[PDB]
Amino acid sequence: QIPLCANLVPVPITNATLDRITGKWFYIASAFRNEEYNKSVQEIQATFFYFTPNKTEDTIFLREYQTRQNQCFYNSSYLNVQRENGTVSRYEGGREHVAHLLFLRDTKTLMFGSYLDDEKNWGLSFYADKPETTKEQLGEFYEALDCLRIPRSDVMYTDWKKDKCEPLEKQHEKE
């Protein structure tokens, strides 16, 4: 009934959109045609993070707990929001990375689309309110990949068993 690509169309970000993405997310999986993104993403064993939007400033405060090479790397920073374009941006190195905020039928998930205008480079990353997804949520992501003609076999997944960031998160919570 609903076209494969319907939820790959940019959607403007409202106050409700910002409310909807507020809180804790787990990075589930990604796949890109861009090789630099594949390279950086390869190394990620696990990641959880917190979104705290500032609706008046169109920014999102990001607190990120990433496991790589069996250790926890914590970073916080501000993401900028481009409301009408339906994108969020993050500054790492000397580089502003822009991504489209996209949604699946399931309200407990979200995707970021990168280089979506470029068939040589496009890709998607998938997040959930739990470190483990249901088979329905995973199928939604696969369908979004299906639209970009990215094979399901190219997906790179996190492994929650590998998380090294639980201890640091709790040592922040007490503070």
Side-chain angles (χ1 to χ4, degrees):
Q1 77 283 296
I2 220 102
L4 207 44
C5 282
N7 60 159
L8 292 284
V9 186
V11 50
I13 291 165
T14 60
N15 284 3
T17 313
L18 291 166
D19 277 349
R20 170 174 183 173
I21 66 181
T22 301
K24 192 183 182 180
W25 300 90
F26 295 83
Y27 163 57
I28 300 302
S30 72
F32 309 82
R33 285 184 175 171
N34 183 260
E35 284 313 342
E36 286 70 34
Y37 271 27
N38 288 336
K39 251 271 134 95
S40 75
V41 149
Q42 274 182 334
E43 304 190 319
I44 309 175
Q45 294 177 300
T47 296
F48 66 87
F49 65 82
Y50 290 79
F51 273 163
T52 313
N54 194 348
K55 294 200 208 95
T56 74
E57 306 279 313
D58 285 356
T59 57
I60 306 163
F61 189 50
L62 169 69
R63 303 195 296 282
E64 174 187 82
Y65 296 76
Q66 176 162 113
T67 304
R68 297 186 313 269
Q69 288 94 56
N70 312 124
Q71 67 199 236
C72 191
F73 294 98
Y74 168 88
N75 287 106
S76 78
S77 60
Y78 287 91
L79 302 193
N80 288 330
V81 176
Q82 305 72 41
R83 281 184 186 240
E84 298 84 353
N85 289 172
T87 59
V88 166
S89 65
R90 174 165 200 189
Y91 295 75
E92 279 166 314
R95 185 138 229 171
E96 192 213 21
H97 301 260
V98 184
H100 280 85
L101 175 50
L102 304 172
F103 295 108
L104 301 169
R105 269 105 215 85
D106 193 314
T107 172
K108 284 174 158 284
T109 60
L110 64 88
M111 296 187 303
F112 284 101
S114 297
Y115 308 117
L116 268 197
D117 65 331
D118 178 357
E119 83 190 6
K120 294 279 166 42
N121 282 291
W122 59 34
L124 295 159
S125 58
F126 181 47
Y127 306 83
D129 70 347
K130 295 175 170 187
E132 319 92 352
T133 57
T134 76
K135 77 202 202 342
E136 292 75 15
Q137 297 162 337
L138 202 56
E140 285 168 27
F141 182 53
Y142 288 168
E143 293 173 349
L145 289 172
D146 293 341
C147 160
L148 297 193
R149 299 181 300 287
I150 301 166
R152 283 158 192 196
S153 48
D154 282 345
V155 169
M156 292 160 197
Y157 297 95
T158 52
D159 179 2
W160 188 242
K161 291 143 34 89
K162 308 228 158 202
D163 175 71
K164 286 269 170 34
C165 286
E166 275 173 16
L168 190 55
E169 178 192 33
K170 185 68 63 278
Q171 186 51 65
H172 278 158
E173 280 181 40
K174 229 203 278 168
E175 277 206 323

